[PDB]
Subunit: 66 residues, 6 copies
Amino acid sequence: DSGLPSVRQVQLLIKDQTPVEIKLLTGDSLFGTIRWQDTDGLGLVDDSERSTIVRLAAIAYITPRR
Amino acid sequence: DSGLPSVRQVQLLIKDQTPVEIKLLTGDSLFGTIRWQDTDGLGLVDDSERSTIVRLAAIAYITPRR
Amino acid sequence: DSGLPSVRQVQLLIKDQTPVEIKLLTGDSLFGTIRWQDTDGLGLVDDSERSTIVRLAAIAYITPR
Amino acid sequence: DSGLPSVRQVQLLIKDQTPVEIKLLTGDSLFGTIRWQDTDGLGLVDDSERSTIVRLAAIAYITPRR
Amino acid sequence: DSGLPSVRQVQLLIKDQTPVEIKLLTGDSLFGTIRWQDTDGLGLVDDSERSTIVRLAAIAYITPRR
Amino acid sequence: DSGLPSVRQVQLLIKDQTPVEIKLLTGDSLFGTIRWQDTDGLGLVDDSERSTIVRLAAIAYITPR
């Protein structure tokens, strides 16, 4: 029962540590878990524990990796 | 006078569970059924319940698959 | 004199059911008749009576054919 | 002495009927004269007197054609 | 506390008439000297006074030519 | 707990002078140290001490190298 389903769904991905693919508007993808989100970006961690700050305006979609 | 037709037309697609193609600004398409929308995204599900969060700013168009 | 010429010009295309080309920021175009507009999208109906919701932010230009 | 030089410069291009190239974010260009502008778009006319509504958010730059 | 550094750094480029490269989101670059900026655009002039209006939203980066 | 994690994380990179890769929406990357940020841009200084103003709307991601 959420009025902000995009935010709620990303907060579930954070809590669950769901592996995701983030397709960027470059056509390329990142893969990892989302550790935080705000109105401008998200924090992604990858399989080597490398941190990335992703701009939300650069994201096409977020889909589970597995 | 019939405001918010973009929202309302997507809500009809949700209600009817209409299979759609979503063309993204990358030139690639996604296929599924829309389950929700908000100001920033929509939730697209495939044939077996995997949910993708699509950013609206990344969408070129939404059309039923025919 | 219309102070909202983008809106006015699209409204004339809707009223007249003028066929158009819509060039998208993907570089590809759609062809059809515009049926409605709002601040986020427009409704394009092609020749197969396929209804498409086009995001305005994704449009490069609209030209009557 | 304008606080809105982008708008003022486009209004000069309109008044002067200066031929321009409009480079779009697709990488492709349009060529013609600008007949009107607003906060969302501009109206371009081309050498065959074909009218085009251009979205400003799709424009990379506007430069004189000659 | 030093706010508006993007604006102020471009104003320094204007003041000094610094030749720049402007990389656009199309992947192509423009070259010239910046003469003005506002909220939506900047004016770039080449070696012989032709002025191009560059939309800021279409800019990836601005850097001096070296 | 910071309520502005995008800003906070970039600020840590500025404070620590951490070298980064900035992937742009052109698909190409820049490499350097971030010196400042605001709501529209950041200042990236590369190894040649070339200062670049990068528009934030043009950034895909930033990652420490």
